[PDB]
Amino acid sequence: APLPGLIYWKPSTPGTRHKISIDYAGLGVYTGPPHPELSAHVAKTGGRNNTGRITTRHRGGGAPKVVRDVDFDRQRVDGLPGVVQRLEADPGRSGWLALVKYSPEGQLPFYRYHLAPADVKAGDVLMSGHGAAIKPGNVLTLRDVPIGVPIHNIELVPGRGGQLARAASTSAVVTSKQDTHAVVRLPSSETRLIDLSCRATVGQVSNHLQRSINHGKAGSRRNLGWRPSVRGIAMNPIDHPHGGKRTRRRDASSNKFIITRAG
RNA sequence: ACGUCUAUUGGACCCGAAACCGAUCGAUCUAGCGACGUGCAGGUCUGACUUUAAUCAGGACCGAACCCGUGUCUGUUGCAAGAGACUGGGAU
Ligand SMILES: [Mg+2]
Ligand SMILES: [Mg+2]
Ligand SMILES: [Mg+2]
Ligand SMILES: [Mg+2]
């Protein structure tokens, strides 16, 4: 079944034989480097902490890391009409961002990066507040969003920004409205109670094609900063003992907010 | 008490381990990572863009610079405490 926005690489040689890549014609305005003041150039880490030893394994190498200042709260852009100039594709996240230009009355116009919902066309105007619309890309309080409409970029403690349901093609659903709790189904089929003063970016995150993508060769996934793994049974007993246990911290403070676990 | 001979504690007739415990120095060899910079002759095939036009992709192919070391032979206090010759593998 050919999806429209995927480049189906022809089997010319092994490696590009079973390779599927996302077309940048579906996202027509990705073209352009990251904005020169919304982005910096930070050194890559390689998986090593401040000591210098490896903490996370199988990481390192690849393209120069560029970091983008994505605004996950939209607190200081409340009540401001922001017209989306273009959509951008960052390699650091599964879902892609959306460049938004805000023109306030007393200040010169500026640009901000926010996560892109499914209904951004590089022409839409986004609005955030108590009185905002129900069209996708609006940030509303959990009280102002309906029951059963998909939402994303959810906060846990108000004023912190959006931390929940923000990967590619993911969304959360509000199913109940307890006065201070508001039971919400997180994308792992887990119900969590999120305070009503928290905010939800209404809509659904883009990059649904993320599941259908296929790096056909080791190099294309190695060039993303992923060094090769090694199986446990391929070693001597000193390195690994080769050749069903729940690991969440029990007696935590967040047991009170969850009704069912990740199903 | 002195002298001699044994005995015990001491390293205790002498020489000889593999060791164990601490805390110095070493990534100028080598393994990984990170920052900056540089290099890849000549051709061949396939796909795409634009064409009055001095553009891109493929862990593509043959092949020098370059990287590695498959087989055989030489060498074995050797030219070399791991080299040489000819075949080889990769070379956007
Ligand atoms: Mg005596
Ligand atoms: Mg040192
Ligand atoms: Mg050769
Ligand atoms: Mg050959």
Short mmCIF file of C-alpha atoms (C1' of nucleotides) and ligand atoms in Angstrom, two decimals:
data_model
loop_
_atom_site.label_atom_id
_atom_site.label_comp_id
_atom_site.label_asym_id
_atom_site.label_seq_id
_atom_site.Cartn_x
_atom_site.Cartn_y
_atom_site.Cartn_z
CA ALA A 1 0.00 0.00 0.00
CA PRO A 2 1.93 3.09 -1.19
CA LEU A 3 1.67 5.97 1.33
CA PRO A 4 1.87 9.39 -0.44
CA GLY A 5 4.74 11.11 1.42
CA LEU A 6 7.34 8.31 1.31
CA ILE A 7 10.25 8.01 -1.16
CA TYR A 8 10.25 4.32 -2.15
CA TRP A 9 13.90 3.64 -3.03
CA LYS A 10 14.21 1.24 -6.00
CA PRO A 11 16.18 -1.99 -5.32
CA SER A 12 19.18 -0.80 -7.44
CA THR A 13 21.81 -2.23 -5.04
CA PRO A 14 21.67 -4.06 -1.64
CA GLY A 15 21.24 -1.46 1.13
CA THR A 16 18.86 0.67 -1.01
CA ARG A 17 16.93 -2.56 -1.79
CA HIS A 18 14.55 -2.45 1.23
CA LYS A 19 14.92 1.27 2.09
CA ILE A 20 11.91 3.60 2.58
CA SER A 21 12.49 7.34 3.27
CA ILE A 22 10.16 10.29 4.07
CA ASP A 23 9.50 12.62 1.09
CA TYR A 24 10.17 16.34 1.74
CA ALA A 25 7.49 17.25 -0.86
CA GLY A 26 4.72 16.26 1.62
CA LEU A 27 6.56 18.64 3.98
CA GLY A 28 7.30 21.12 1.16
CA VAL A 29 8.81 23.93 3.25
CA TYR A 30 11.39 21.96 5.31
CA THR A 31 14.10 23.50 3.01
CA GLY A 32 16.44 25.92 4.80
CA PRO A 33 18.98 25.64 7.66
CA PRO A 34 17.79 26.06 11.31
CA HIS A 35 17.04 29.74 12.17
CA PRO A 36 20.29 31.53 13.23
CA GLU A 37 19.06 32.77 16.65
CA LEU A 38 16.50 30.03 17.50
CA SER A 39 19.31 27.45 17.21
CA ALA A 40 22.88 26.91 18.49
CA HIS A 41 25.68 24.42 17.72
CA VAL A 42 26.36 22.18 20.76
CA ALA A 43 29.10 19.50 20.81
CA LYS A 44 28.01 15.85 20.58
CA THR A 45 28.35 13.76 23.76
CA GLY A 46 29.02 10.16 22.68
CA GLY A 47 27.11 8.85 25.71
CA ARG A 48 29.70 10.06 28.27
CA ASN A 49 28.80 11.97 31.48
CA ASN A 50 30.80 14.71 33.29
CA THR A 51 33.24 11.99 34.54
CA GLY A 52 34.00 11.01 30.90
CA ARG A 53 32.99 7.31 31.13
CA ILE A 54 30.17 5.72 29.07
CA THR A 55 26.78 5.93 30.85
CA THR A 56 24.43 5.27 27.89
CA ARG A 57 25.79 2.71 25.40
CA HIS A 58 25.54 2.34 21.56
CA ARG A 59 25.62 6.13 20.98
CA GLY A 60 28.14 8.38 19.19
CA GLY A 61 29.24 9.77 15.80
CA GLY A 62 27.12 11.13 12.97
CA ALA A 63 26.05 14.59 11.77
CA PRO A 64 26.98 17.73 13.80
CA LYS A 65 24.35 18.16 16.55
CA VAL A 66 22.22 21.33 16.18
CA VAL A 67 19.78 22.16 19.02
CA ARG A 68 16.54 24.13 18.53
CA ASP A 69 14.75 26.30 21.13
CA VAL A 70 11.29 24.68 21.06
CA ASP A 71 8.71 26.47 23.27
CA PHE A 72 6.71 23.72 25.04
CA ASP A 73 4.71 26.08 27.34
CA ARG A 74 3.50 28.88 24.97
CA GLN A 75 3.00 30.91 28.22
CA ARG A 76 4.31 34.28 26.96
CA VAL A 77 2.59 33.99 23.55
CA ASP A 78 -0.94 33.77 25.05
CA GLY A 79 -3.61 35.87 23.28
CA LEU A 80 -1.16 36.57 20.41
CA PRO A 81 -2.03 35.65 16.79
CA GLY A 82 0.96 33.65 15.52
CA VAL A 83 0.96 32.92 11.77
CA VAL A 84 2.89 29.71 10.94
CA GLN A 85 5.54 30.69 8.36
CA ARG A 86 6.92 27.22 7.53
CA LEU A 87 7.26 23.64 8.83
CA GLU A 88 10.79 22.41 9.67
CA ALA A 89 12.16 18.86 10.07
CA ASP A 90 14.59 18.48 13.03
CA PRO A 91 16.65 15.23 13.30
CA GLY A 92 16.63 15.42 17.15
CA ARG A 93 12.90 14.58 17.45
CA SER A 94 10.59 12.02 15.78
CA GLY A 95 7.84 14.58 15.10
CA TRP A 96 8.60 17.80 13.23
CA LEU A 97 8.31 21.41 14.43
CA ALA A 98 6.48 24.44 13.03
CA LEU A 99 8.03 27.94 12.75
CA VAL A 100 5.53 30.57 14.05
CA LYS A 101 5.94 34.37 13.72
CA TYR A 102 4.29 36.55 16.40
CA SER A 103 3.75 40.26 15.64
CA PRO A 104 2.94 42.14 18.89
CA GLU A 105 1.85 45.83 18.85
CA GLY A 106 4.65 47.45 20.87
CA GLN A 107 7.50 45.11 19.83
CA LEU A 108 9.19 44.03 16.56
CA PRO A 109 8.04 40.63 15.18
CA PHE A 110 9.89 37.48 16.36
CA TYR A 111 9.89 33.73 15.61
CA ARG A 112 9.35 30.68 17.87
CA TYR A 113 9.52 26.88 17.36
CA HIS A 114 6.55 24.75 18.53
CA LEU A 115 5.58 21.13 17.79
CA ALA A 116 3.46 20.81 14.65
CA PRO A 117 -0.05 19.29 14.87
CA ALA A 118 -1.77 17.51 11.93
CA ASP A 119 -3.58 20.65 10.64
CA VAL A 120 -0.68 23.14 10.10
CA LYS A 121 -0.34 24.23 6.43
CA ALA A 122 2.33 27.02 6.73
CA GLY A 123 -0.56 29.55 6.53
CA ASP A 124 -2.60 28.97 9.72
CA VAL A 125 -2.79 31.35 12.72
CA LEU A 126 -2.38 29.79 16.20
CA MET A 127 -4.02 31.19 19.37
CA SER A 128 -3.49 30.15 23.02
CA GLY A 129 -5.66 30.99 26.05
CA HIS A 130 -8.85 30.46 28.12
CA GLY A 131 -10.93 31.78 25.16
CA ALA A 132 -9.00 29.98 22.36
CA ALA A 133 -10.65 28.00 19.56
CA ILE A 134 -11.02 24.19 19.31
CA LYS A 135 -9.22 24.02 15.92
CA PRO A 136 -5.90 22.03 16.05
CA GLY A 137 -2.69 23.83 17.15
CA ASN A 138 -4.44 25.82 19.91
CA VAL A 139 -3.24 25.53 23.53
CA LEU A 140 -6.21 25.33 25.94
CA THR A 141 -6.57 24.49 29.64
CA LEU A 142 -7.68 20.90 30.40
CA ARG A 143 -11.13 22.27 31.50
CA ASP A 144 -11.67 24.02 28.12
CA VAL A 145 -10.94 20.88 25.99
CA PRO A 146 -13.82 18.40 25.36
CA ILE A 147 -14.02 14.70 26.39
CA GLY A 148 -12.65 12.33 23.70
CA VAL A 149 -10.95 14.89 21.38
CA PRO A 150 -7.25 13.93 20.89
CA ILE A 151 -4.74 16.30 22.60
CA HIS A 152 -0.93 16.50 22.87
CA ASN A 153 1.92 18.37 24.66
CA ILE A 154 0.30 17.88 28.12
CA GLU A 155 1.84 19.31 31.33
CA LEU A 156 2.00 17.53 34.73
CA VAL A 157 2.63 20.53 37.05
CA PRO A 158 1.32 23.88 35.69
CA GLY A 159 3.89 26.47 34.49
CA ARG A 160 6.47 23.81 33.48
CA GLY A 161 5.48 23.28 29.81
CA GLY A 162 4.29 20.24 27.81
CA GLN A 163 5.89 16.87 28.67
CA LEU A 164 3.28 14.23 27.66
CA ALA A 165 2.29 12.73 24.24
CA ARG A 166 4.83 14.73 22.18
CA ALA A 167 6.46 12.07 19.94
CA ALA A 168 5.55 11.57 16.26
CA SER A 169 1.87 10.65 15.56
CA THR A 170 0.90 10.33 19.26
CA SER A 171 -2.04 11.82 21.22
CA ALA A 172 -3.76 11.69 24.64
CA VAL A 173 -7.52 11.44 25.38
CA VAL A 174 -9.46 12.96 28.33
CA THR A 175 -12.13 10.43 29.41
CA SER A 176 -13.38 11.86 32.75
CA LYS A 177 -13.56 15.23 34.58
CA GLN A 178 -12.92 14.89 38.36
CA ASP A 179 -12.90 18.57 39.59
CA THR A 180 -9.11 18.70 40.27
CA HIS A 181 -8.06 15.40 38.62
CA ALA A 182 -9.44 14.93 35.05
CA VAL A 183 -8.58 11.23 34.26
CA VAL A 184 -6.56 11.20 30.97
CA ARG A 185 -5.59 8.13 28.88
CA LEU A 186 -1.84 8.51 28.14
CA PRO A 187 -0.72 6.94 24.78
CA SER A 188 0.59 3.75 26.53
CA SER A 189 -3.07 2.86 27.50
CA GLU A 190 -2.26 4.27 30.97
CA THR A 191 -4.75 6.49 32.84
CA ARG A 192 -3.21 9.43 34.74
CA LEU A 193 -4.96 12.20 36.75
CA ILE A 194 -3.73 15.59 35.43
CA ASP A 195 -4.61 18.92 37.17
CA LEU A 196 -7.16 21.08 35.26
CA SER A 197 -4.90 24.21 35.29
CA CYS A 198 -2.48 22.19 33.08
CA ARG A 199 -2.65 22.90 29.34
CA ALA A 200 -3.14 20.65 26.30
CA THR A 201 -2.17 21.56 22.71
CA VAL A 202 -5.33 20.38 20.89
CA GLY A 203 -4.86 18.30 17.73
CA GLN A 204 -2.68 15.29 16.85
CA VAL A 205 1.15 15.28 16.38
CA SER A 206 2.36 14.99 12.72
CA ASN A 207 4.97 12.62 11.15
CA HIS A 208 2.59 9.62 11.06
CA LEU A 209 4.96 8.25 8.34
CA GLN A 210 7.56 7.73 11.16
CA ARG A 211 6.39 4.09 11.64
CA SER A 212 6.60 3.31 7.88
CA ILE A 213 10.19 4.65 7.49
CA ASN A 214 12.94 2.06 6.89
CA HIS A 215 16.69 2.73 7.00
CA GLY A 216 17.80 0.05 4.52
CA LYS A 217 21.43 -0.13 5.70
CA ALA A 218 23.56 0.05 8.88
CA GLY A 219 25.28 3.26 7.73
CA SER A 220 22.11 5.39 7.49
CA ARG A 221 21.21 4.54 11.15
CA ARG A 222 24.94 4.77 12.19
CA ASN A 223 25.14 8.29 10.65
CA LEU A 224 22.28 9.35 13.00
CA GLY A 225 24.59 8.82 16.03
CA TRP A 226 23.85 5.14 16.80
CA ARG A 227 27.00 2.98 17.26
CA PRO A 228 26.46 -0.82 16.83
CA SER A 229 25.21 -3.04 19.71
CA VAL A 230 26.72 -6.43 20.75
CA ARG A 231 24.62 -9.43 21.96
CA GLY A 232 25.12 -10.64 25.56
CA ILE A 233 25.85 -14.31 24.64
CA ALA A 234 28.75 -13.22 22.37
CA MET A 235 31.14 -12.67 25.33
CA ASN A 236 33.29 -14.20 28.10
CA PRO A 237 31.70 -14.38 31.63
CA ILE A 238 33.62 -11.31 33.01
CA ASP A 239 32.05 -8.94 30.39
CA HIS A 240 28.52 -10.43 30.57
CA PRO A 241 27.23 -13.65 32.31
CA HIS A 242 25.96 -15.00 28.93
CA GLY A 243 28.74 -17.18 27.39
CA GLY A 244 10.15 -10.59 34.16
CA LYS A 245 10.99 -7.97 36.85
CA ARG A 246 9.08 -4.68 37.30
CA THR A 247 11.74 -1.95 37.79
CA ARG A 248 9.64 1.13 38.80
CA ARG A 249 10.57 2.76 42.14
CA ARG A 250 7.97 1.46 44.62
CA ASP A 251 6.69 3.84 47.39
CA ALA A 252 6.90 6.83 44.97
CA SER A 253 4.80 10.03 45.21
CA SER A 254 3.11 9.52 41.79
CA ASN A 255 1.13 6.32 42.64
CA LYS A 256 -1.83 8.55 43.70
CA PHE A 257 -2.33 9.93 40.15
CA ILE A 258 -2.56 6.65 38.15
CA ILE A 259 -5.69 4.42 38.00
CA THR A 260 -4.49 1.73 35.54
CA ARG A 261 -0.89 1.00 34.44
CA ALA A 262 0.62 0.89 30.92
CA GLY A 263 -1.53 -1.60 29.00
"C1'" A B 1 79.33 -16.66 85.72
"C1'" C B 2 82.48 -17.95 81.20
"C1'" G B 3 83.13 -21.59 77.07
"C1'" U B 4 80.76 -25.10 73.63
"C1'" C B 5 76.35 -27.56 71.57
"C1'" U B 6 71.20 -27.66 70.88
"C1'" A B 7 66.06 -25.21 71.41
"C1'" U B 8 62.33 -20.78 70.95
"C1'" U B 9 61.21 -15.78 68.97
"C1'" G B 10 62.95 -12.95 65.37
"C1'" G B 11 64.52 -12.13 57.81
"C1'" A B 12 67.69 -16.07 61.09
"C1'" C B 13 72.51 -20.95 56.77
"C1'" C B 14 72.26 -18.57 51.63
"C1'" C B 15 69.73 -17.84 46.65
"C1'" G B 16 64.97 -18.58 43.72
"C1'" A B 17 58.86 -17.88 42.72
"C1'" A B 18 54.00 -17.53 40.78
"C1'" A B 19 51.52 -14.02 44.25
"C1'" C B 20 48.30 -10.53 47.59
"C1'" C B 21 47.35 -5.33 49.44
"C1'" G B 22 47.94 0.05 48.75
"C1'" A B 23 48.91 4.80 45.59
"C1'" U B 24 52.20 6.95 41.68
"C1'" C B 25 52.77 7.40 36.36
"C1'" G B 26 50.95 6.41 31.61
"C1'" A B 27 45.49 7.15 25.68
"C1'" U B 28 53.19 10.28 21.84
"C1'" C B 29 51.58 2.74 20.66
"C1'" U B 30 46.59 1.05 20.54
"C1'" A B 31 40.49 1.06 21.50
"C1'" G B 32 36.38 4.35 21.73
"C1'" C B 33 34.55 9.51 21.83
"C1'" G B 34 34.81 14.84 21.03
"C1'" A B 35 36.42 19.83 18.44
"C1'" C B 36 38.75 22.02 14.20
"C1'" G B 37 40.90 21.26 9.40
"C1'" U B 38 42.31 18.41 4.95
"C1'" G B 39 42.16 14.44 0.89
"C1'" C B 40 39.98 10.95 -2.49
"C1'" A B 41 43.87 10.55 -10.66
"C1'" G B 42 41.18 8.37 -14.49
"C1'" G B 43 36.98 6.22 -16.24
"C1'" U B 44 31.86 2.90 -16.18
"C1'" C B 45 26.57 1.98 -15.00
"C1'" U B 46 21.77 3.39 -12.88
"C1'" G B 47 17.96 7.11 -10.82
"C1'" A B 48 16.43 12.27 -10.25
"C1'" C B 49 16.48 18.07 -11.17
"C1'" U B 50 17.25 21.89 -14.79
"C1'" U B 51 18.22 22.55 -19.71
"C1'" U B 52 20.63 28.35 -24.57
"C1'" A B 53 22.66 26.02 -18.84
"C1'" A B 54 30.02 24.79 -15.21
"C1'" U B 55 23.63 19.99 -10.53
"C1'" C B 56 22.77 16.04 -7.03
"C1'" A B 57 22.20 10.69 -5.13
"C1'" G B 58 24.18 4.77 -4.81
"C1'" G B 59 27.23 1.82 2.57
"C1'" A B 60 27.04 1.20 -7.00
"C1'" C B 61 31.48 -1.12 -10.60
"C1'" C B 62 36.76 -1.30 -12.60
"C1'" G B 63 40.98 1.15 -11.08
"C1'" A B 64 46.01 4.94 -9.19
"C1'" A B 65 47.29 8.33 -4.46
"C1'" C B 66 45.74 6.26 0.31
"C1'" C B 67 44.00 2.27 4.03
"C1'" C B 68 44.26 -3.21 4.95
"C1'" G B 69 46.82 -7.91 4.83
"C1'" U B 70 44.19 -13.42 1.20
"C1'" G B 71 47.49 -17.14 -0.84
"C1'" U B 72 52.40 -18.76 -2.25
"C1'" C B 73 57.62 -18.15 -1.96
"C1'" U B 74 62.02 -15.93 0.44
"C1'" G B 75 63.76 -14.75 5.39
"C1'" U B 76 64.03 -17.47 10.58
"C1'" U B 77 70.74 -14.09 15.89
"C1'" G B 78 66.38 -11.61 9.25
"C1'" C B 79 66.79 -6.03 5.82
"C1'" A B 80 62.70 -6.43 9.97
"C1'" A B 81 61.89 -8.74 18.39
"C1'" G B 82 56.57 -9.78 12.05
"C1'" A B 83 60.00 -7.62 6.68
"C1'" G B 84 60.30 -8.22 1.09
"C1'" A B 85 58.44 -9.91 -4.00
"C1'" C B 86 54.16 -11.31 -6.83
"C1'" U B 87 49.15 -12.05 -6.48
"C1'" G B 88 45.12 -9.79 -3.51
"C1'" G B 89 40.44 -6.65 -0.45
"C1'" G B 90 38.29 -1.54 0.11
"C1'" A B 91 38.97 3.05 -2.28
"C1'" U B 92 32.01 9.15 -1.68
MG MG C 1 75.61 -19.67 79.10
MG MG C 2 46.70 10.18 31.54
MG MG C 3 45.15 -3.24 -5.06
MG MG C 4 37.98 -7.84 -7.51
#
